[PDB]
């Protein structure tokens, strides 16, 4: 097991857990706290030679079992025979519904925030359980048996959770297809899993717009010879084509069925679901006990969930984030979870914050792209909200840039929430690296430290060897299986082994580069700068960038730091001009430096300043500051990469050279 830091010393780059995460002002005392060493003390129990005791206790405390397990773990990466709690039997729907309904039937399971705010409402655990049971009985009437695949093409209405959990209740293997997918993408996933049954809607609604799901379904199913039954949810009631025999209305089928259904006794390692990635699509297969446990534990510790919290994950159930942090994680824990059907700016950019104040959301889990869009829309939509019910603000998707991080921290959090950067993928099942909000001091853009059960290291790809120490960079690997790791790729285990297990034998290969900084913090896809120290002057990329943007001809700018034998660190700037601008190029690099000095002072000049045609960006619009930083460090050849306009990196490489 790779040792973590003994301690993390204080510094002006660390954001210590704020009062709401200290059990102050009436907030729940955090599960893990109050400092780095408290996280390490508990985490050390979850990896290494004595961790079976911790995992056996956590599994028996977190989940209800029909049969106890005897063995904690077995198997490994080499052959893809990972086993957790193998002799145990349980049911995911029993753990997400039944046991809570028996304790408090009227507790809210789902906050359904409809596309039109006026149509939003609460769904009790009882109501959710009854709809799940009805749908499960409908599936059984179709002949769906334990182990059969069932495709789900559903938009973000609360019944999506019933659809998922009905498959789980009877031991079917649900395969959720994102409701924005085209007919060809839907077709390819429905064929590959060989399901005979599809659950979908007549239409979806999102951002005041209609998604024509049934129209798309009909197109795909023309090339899907095995699908015999389609269960159609009446989300909008508008006229849509229905195929006699094949297609049946959700409401009419469920009305024939009783509102209870027994739970199938599933082995820990029976498959729970297939989820296709977005070569050809691969069905990542997750089993039951270990996946369910990982999501329940991660939701509890990474977001410091307590029994009455109201968790708002603004993702989609078609992706692993929705599987894990809308449905399975929070319902396993018996709390309230949000199914959010709209966009961040429908009807207005105030939508997230009205939501948070209406339901008193205690945690929010969103994507940097939504944060960037709300920043673009301005402070008026957010600054006069209350938002104090929030304790933790989480980030998921691409690694976040400091500018979105600070906007999140300042405006959504009002500098009173812990910001939880999370790193994981469909194949890890649950969050792999993230701060525990009550214990870890944060750095903008950094995932910090591995979660319980995660033993990660950094490998030099040019040598294959583990890199020891802090301030190292390479590719991220995991030394041992964890309970929620994916067990195979559906009917293509060879692809599972070659992709994840072959490149670094003995390790799980995430596919991402990472850096471990001098404090031991993890930096997925590279370190990103926030405050840079040029000759004892603490300047932020934000300060420098907004000084540059004052030049009336400047369109976009991104600033990075790098070591410097004169000023300790130095500031390198990349600037793009607006097209209304014609002015020799060197007389511009001299004109912007003077402009930065006029605003910030003589020692705030960037050491170098590169005029480029555009900034390197991903398809989401995110500026690739981490790449710009590596290029300045001299690692343009050690970059990697699948994004927007690869000529720009070569352009940027040519200008810095």
Automatic annotation (TrEMBL):
<dbReference type="GO" id="GO:0019427">
    <property type="term" value="P:acetyl-CoA biosynthetic process from acetate"/>
</dbReference>
<feature type="domain" description="Acetyl-coenzyme A synthetase N-terminal">
    <location>
        <begin position="50"/>
        <end position="96"/>
    </location>
</feature>
<dbReference type="InterPro" id="IPR032387">
    <property type="entry name" value="ACAS_N"/>
</dbReference>
<feature type="binding site">
    <location>
        <position position="597"/>
    </location>
    <ligand>
        <name>CoA</name>
    </ligand>
</feature>
<keyword id="KW-0479">Metal-binding</keyword>
<dbReference type="GO" id="GO:0005524">
    <property type="term" value="F:ATP binding"/>
</dbReference>
<feature type="binding site">
    <location>
        <position position="426"/>
    </location>
    <ligand>
        <name>ATP</name>
    </ligand>
</feature>
<keyword id="KW-0547">Nucleotide-binding</keyword>
<dbReference type="Pfam" id="PF00501">
    <property type="entry name" value="AMP-binding"/>
</dbReference>
<feature type="region of interest" description="Disordered">
    <location>
        <begin position="1"/>
        <end position="32"/>
    </location>
</feature>
<dbReference type="InterPro" id="IPR042099">
    <property type="entry name" value="ANL_N_sf"/>
</dbReference>
<comment type="similarity">
    <text>Belongs to the ATP-dependent AMP-binding enzyme family.</text>
</comment>
<feature type="binding site">
    <location>
        <position position="78"/>
    </location>
    <ligand>
        <name>Mg(2+)</name>
    </ligand>
</feature>
<feature type="binding site">
    <location>
        <position position="527"/>
    </location>
    <ligand>
        <name>ATP</name>
    </ligand>
</feature>
<dbReference type="InterPro" id="IPR025110">
    <property type="entry name" value="AMP-bd_C"/>
</dbReference>
<dbReference type="GO" id="GO:0046872">
    <property type="term" value="F:metal ion binding"/>
</dbReference>
<dbReference type="GO" id="GO:0003987">
    <property type="term" value="F:acetate-CoA ligase activity"/>
</dbReference>
<keyword id="KW-0436">Ligase</keyword>
<keyword id="KW-0067">ATP-binding</keyword>
<dbReference type="InterPro" id="IPR000873">
    <property type="entry name" value="AMP-dep_synth/lig_dom"/>
</dbReference>
<dbReference type="InterPro" id="IPR045851">
    <property type="entry name" value="AMP-bd_C_sf"/>
</dbReference>
<dbReference type="InterPro" id="IPR020845">
    <property type="entry name" value="AMP-binding_CS"/>
</dbReference>
<feature type="binding site">
    <location>
        <position position="206"/>
    </location>
    <ligand>
        <name>CoA</name>
    </ligand>
</feature>
<dbReference type="Pfam" id="PF13193">
    <property type="entry name" value="AMP-binding_C"/>
</dbReference>
<feature type="binding site">
    <location>
        <position position="278"/>
    </location>
    <ligand>
        <name>ATP</name>
    </ligand>
</feature>
<feature type="binding site">
    <location>
        <position position="622"/>
    </location>
    <ligand>
        <name>ATP</name>
    </ligand>
</feature>
<dbReference type="InterPro" id="IPR011904">
    <property type="entry name" value="Ac_CoA_lig"/>
</dbReference>
<protein>
    <recommendedName>
        <fullName>Acetyl-coenzyme A synthetase</fullName>
        <ecNumber>6.2.1.1</ecNumber>
    </recommendedName>
</protein>
<feature type="domain" description="AMP-binding enzyme C-terminal">
    <location>
        <begin position="543"/>
        <end position="622"/>
    </location>
</feature>
<dbReference type="GO" id="GO:0016208">
    <property type="term" value="F:AMP binding"/>
</dbReference>
<dbReference type="GO" id="GO:0005829">
    <property type="term" value="C:cytosol"/>
</dbReference>
<feature type="binding site">
    <location>
        <position position="536"/>
    </location>
    <ligand>
        <name>CoA</name>
    </ligand>
</feature>
<feature type="binding site">
    <location>
        <position position="316"/>
    </location>
    <ligand>
        <name>CoA</name>
    </ligand>
</feature>
<feature type="domain" description="AMP-dependent synthetase/ligase">
    <location>
        <begin position="98"/>
        <end position="482"/>
    </location>
</feature>
<feature type="modified residue" description="N6-acetyllysine">
    <location>
        <position position="622"/>
    </location>
</feature>
<dbReference type="Pfam" id="PF16177">
    <property type="entry name" value="ACAS_N"/>
</dbReference>
């Amino acid at each position: 097991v790779h040792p973590l830091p003994d301690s993390v010393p204080e510094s002006e780059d660390l954001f210590a857990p704020p009062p709401r995460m200290q059990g102050k002002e009436g907030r729940p005392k955090p599960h893990i706290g109050p400092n780095y060493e408290s996280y390490v003390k508990e985490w050390a129990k979850t990896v290494g030679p004595n961790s079976d005791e911790w995992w056996a206790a956590k599994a028996r405390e977190t989940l209800d079992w029909y049969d106890d397990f005897k063995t904690v773990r077995a198997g490994g990466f080499e052959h893809g025979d990972v086993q957790w709690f193998p002799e145990g039997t349980l049911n995911a729907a029993y753990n997400c519904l039944d046991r809570h309904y028996y304790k408090n039937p009227k507790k809210t399971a789902i906050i359904y925030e409809a596309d039109e705010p006026s149509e939003s409402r609460e769904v009790s655990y009882e109501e959710l359980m009854q709809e799940t049971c009805r749908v499960a009985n409908v599936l059984k009437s179709y002949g769906v048996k334990k182990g059969d695949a069932v495709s789900i093409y559903l938009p973000m209405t609360w019944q999506a959770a019933a659809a998922f959990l009905a498959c789980a209740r009877i031991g079917a293997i649900h395969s959720a297809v994102f409701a924005g997918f085209s007919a060809e993408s839907l077709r390819d996933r429905v064929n590959d899993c060989e399901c005979k049954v599809l659950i979908t809607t007549d239409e979806g609604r999102r951002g005041g717009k209609t998604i024509a799901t049934k129209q798309i379904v009909d197109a795909a199913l023309q090339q899907c010879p095995l699908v015999e039954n389609v269960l159609v949810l009446r989300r909008t009631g508008n006229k849509v084509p229905m195929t006699e025999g094949r297609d049946k209305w959700w409401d009419e089928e469920c009305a024939k069925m009783p509102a209870y259904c027994p739970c199938e006794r599933m082995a820990s390692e029976d498959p729970l679901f297939i989820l296709y990635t977005s070569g050809k699509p691969k069905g990542v297969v997750h089993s039951t006990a270990g996946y369910l446990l990982g999501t329940a534990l991660t939701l509890k510790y990474v977001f410091d969930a307590h029994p009455d919290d109201r968790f708002a994950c603004m993702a989609d159930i078609g992706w692993i984030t929705g599987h894990s942090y809308i449905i399975y994680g929070p319902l396993a824990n018996g709390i309230t979870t949000a199914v959010f059907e709209s966009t961040p700016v429908y009807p207005t950019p105030s939508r997230y914050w009205d939501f948070v104040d209406k339901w008193k959301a205690t945690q929010l889990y969103t994507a940097p792209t939504a944060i960037r869009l709300l920043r673009r829309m301005g402070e008026d939509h957010v600054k006069n909200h209350d938002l104090s019910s929030l304790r933790v603000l989480g980030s998921v998707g691409e690694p976040i840039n400091p500018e979105a991080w600070h906007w999140y921290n300042d405006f959504a959090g009002k500098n009173q929430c812990a910001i939880v950067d999370t790193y994981w993928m469909t194949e890890t099942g649950s969050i792999s690296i993230a701060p525990l909000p009550g214990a870890i001091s944060t750095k903008p853009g950094s995932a910090t430290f591995p979660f319980f059960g995660m033993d990660v290291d950094i490998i030099d790809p040019q040598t294959g060897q583990v890199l020891e120490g802090n301030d190292v960079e390479g590719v991220l690997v995991a030394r041992r299986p964890w309970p929620s790791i994916a067990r195979t790729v559906y009917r293509d285990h060879k692809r599972y082994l070659e992709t994840y297990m072959k490149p670094y034998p003995g390790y799980f290969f995430f596919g991402d580069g990472a850096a471990r900084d001098y404090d031991g913090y993890m930096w997925i896809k590279g370190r990103v700068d926030d405050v840079i120290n040029v000759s004892g002057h603490r300047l932020s990329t934000a300060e420098v960038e907004s000084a540059l943007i004052l030049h009336k001809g400047v369109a976009e700018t991104a600033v990075v730091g790098c070591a410097d034998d004169l000023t300790g660190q130095a500031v390198y700037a990349f600037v793009t001009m607006k097209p209304e601008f014609d002015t020799k190029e060197a007389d511009l690099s001299k004109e912007l430096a003077i402009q930065v000095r006029k605003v910030i002072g003589p020692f705030a000049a960037p050491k170098k300043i590169y005029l480029v045609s555009d900034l390197p960006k991903t398809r989401s619009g995110k500026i690739m500051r981490r790449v710009l930083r590596k290029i300045v460090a001299g690692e343009g050849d050690q970059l990697g990469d699948s994004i927007a306009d690869p000529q720009i990196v070569e352009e940027v490489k040519q200008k810095v050279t």
